[PDB]
């Protein structure tokens, strides 16, 4: 019995996982992202520098026996990317990708994994919406290479709109925390009630009620909000990415400006990619603080792609034990040359140790018929 949220990945699924990990990584590299492979463990000083409380609780602690200091098993690779970018990245644009195991103390979703294979990409040093657009192009090039029948739906948000309204309205922390709870639960009636007594209340009502209609959202806001440079630009970025997703990538997009998960770490646009009707996003991404250094990025659990992808059925070959042992030395070398060529092409060929040696999932035998080794289906 394994712990909850911990599963073996076996056999054809393991092979599929290895193919996905490799092919997605190679794609990222061809788009100009530098692969990095940080370690599973670090001192907490670096691993949880500026971490949220959720990330801290999600991170297993262990003690370094060489120094007596605290370490963690990583729950997230992104902070390691920041460490790496700070040492190696310079002031200009730097692009990174990664694919590695991470461990969580508790699952995120119902029956979720505590050991995802986290794959991702990040761009540092570009303030423009063009960096987010590039990340979308990389993501969708990757998704389309998987030839899935499952449909990816994208939900866009932008935490700056709410953050700026909260500043201009001069909300207290408890007022901010209440609206976030009401937004999280879509409690429109009680939101309507609370907003009648708050300053710029109708703006906070408008986000929830009309935030889905992003084309018209600026024109539904109050004159103070429409004069705020950061709100106008954030709404503009949403329209740009929505358009790019529909037109370039045939992607269904919804907008939710009340999506305020990761209020702590997101600094702008946010992206959540859903697979069919599964509750937890397959892909999570958006703007964050790369430090003043801009950063944007996404990540996903490669293991969640296994249920939605298919490889071609393998060719699993057994050489006939008896026939092979009847061969002279020159015949054996010719047969092994043939076997090497089959293996170069991806055939899985077992040289039998005994007459009973049989591989799992046998599709073919390599058999001798009139001085000729041919493949025959079983």
């Amino acid at each position: 019995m394994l712990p909850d949220g911990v599963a073996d990945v076996l056999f054809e699924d393991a092979h599929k996982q290895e193919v996905l990990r490799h092919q997605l990584t190679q794609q990222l590299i061809t788009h100009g992202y530098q692969l990095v492979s940080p370690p599973m463990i670090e001192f907490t000083e670096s691993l949880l520098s500026g971490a949220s409380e959720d990330l801290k609780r999600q991170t297993f602690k262990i003690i370094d026996q060489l120094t007596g200091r605290l370490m963690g098993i990583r729950a997230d690779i992104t902070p390691q990317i920041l460490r790496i970018d700070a040492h190696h990245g310079g002031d200009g644009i730097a692009r990174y990708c990664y694919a590695g195991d991470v461990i969580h103390t508790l699952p995120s979703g119902l029956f979720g994994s505590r050991t995802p294979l986290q794959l991702g990409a990040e761009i540092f040093g570009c303030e423009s919406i063009a960096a987010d657009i590039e990340l979308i192009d990389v993501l969708f090039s990757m998704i389309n290479s998987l030839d899935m029948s499952a449909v990816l739906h994208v939900d866009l948000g932008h935490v700056t709109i709410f953050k700026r309204l909260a500043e201009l309205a001069a909300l207290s922390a408890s007022d901010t925390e209440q609206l976030m709870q009401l937004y999280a639960n879509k409690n429109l009636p009680e939101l309507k009630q609370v907003c009648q007594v708050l300053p710029m209340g109708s703006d906070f009502y408008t986000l929830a009620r009309f935030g889905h209609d992003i084309a018209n959202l600026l024109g539904r806001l109050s004159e103070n909000a429409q004069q705020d440079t950061k709100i106008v630009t954030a709404i503009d970025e949403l329209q740009r990415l929505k358009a790019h997703l529909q037109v370039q990538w045939q992607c269904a997009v919804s907008i939710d400006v009340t999506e305020l998960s990761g209020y702590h770490y997101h600094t702008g646009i946010v992206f959540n990619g859903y697979i069919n009707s599964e509750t937890q996003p397959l892909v999570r991404g958006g703007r964050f603080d790369g430090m003043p250094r801009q950063a944007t990025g996404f990540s996903m659990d490669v293991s969640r792609l296994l249920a939605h992808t298919q490889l071609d059925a393998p060719f699993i070959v057994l050489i006939d034990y008896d026939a092979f042992n009847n061969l002279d030395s020159a015949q054996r070398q010719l047969l092994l040359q043939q076997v090497a060529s089959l293996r170069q092409q991806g055939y899985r060929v077992t040289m039998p140790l005994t007459a009973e040696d049989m591989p799992v999932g046998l599709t073919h035998r390599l058999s001798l018929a009139d001085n000729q080794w041919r493949l025959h289906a079983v």
Partner: protein
């Protein structure tokens, strides 16, 4: 089944819910007590009803076995309503979660032993008061626990306070107000909003 599945709490909550339903499109054809049936058709052919233990409603909704449901706020806080939307305060089946001990009895000079169904709520409440407690899990008759020494205090839902007073107990601390709430499954909210909106609006109008 392509319509909505509605998870209702069996006991005290079910009585005050029936008027809210009838004002919407929904009303049961049979009665829950007389019939030994689990799944109940309604006046609306698009709505199905499940009569469940109050403690099970959030589980059924969160896993999507029901699309939405009526559940006590005491149950939601204890359960952790992490994967559901709490859409409406229905303002029915109102009560309070409280601490209660024996009448005029002194608190002992040790970690308080709390006997309760609401173990997460108890732990959380006493943690917010900076007190360390030993929690004992019980499922029924909280009133009894202090009388035979099983804990020092209890945590339980209190309305009039008569059950506490009839067993020689008194309320001590107010933890929070409680009422039944309308909860909806995250996925159902996106996929079946057309079916939900008219029912949600009629519940909203009924208070």
């Amino acid at each position: 089944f392509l319509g909505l599945t509605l998870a209702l709490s069996k006991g005290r909550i079910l009585e005050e819910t029936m008027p809210l339903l009838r004002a919407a499109g929904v009303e049961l054809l049979e009665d829950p007590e007389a019939s030994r049936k689990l799944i109940f058709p309604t006046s609306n052919p698009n709505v199905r009803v499940l009569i469940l233990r109050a403690s099970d409603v959030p589980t059924y909704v969160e896993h999507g076995a029901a699309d939405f449901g009526v559940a006590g706020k005491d149950v939601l806080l204890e359960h952790g309503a992490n994967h559901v939307y709490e859409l409406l305060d229905l303002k029915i089946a109102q009560c309070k979660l409280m601490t209660a001990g024996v009448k005029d009895a002194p608190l002992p000079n040790r970690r308080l032993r709390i006997a309760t169904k609401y173990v997460n709520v108890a732990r959380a409440y006493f943690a917010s008061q900076g007190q360390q407690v030993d929690v004992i899990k019980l499922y029924g008759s909280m009133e009894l626990a202090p009388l035979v020494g099983l804990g020092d205090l209890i945590v339980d839902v209190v309305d009039t306070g008569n059950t506490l007073r009839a067993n020689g107990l008194e309320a001590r601390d107010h933890i929070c107000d409680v009422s039944s709430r309308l909860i909806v499954n995250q996925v159902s909210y996106k996929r079946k909003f057309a079916l939900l909106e008219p029912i949600l609006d009629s519940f909203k109008n009924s208070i």
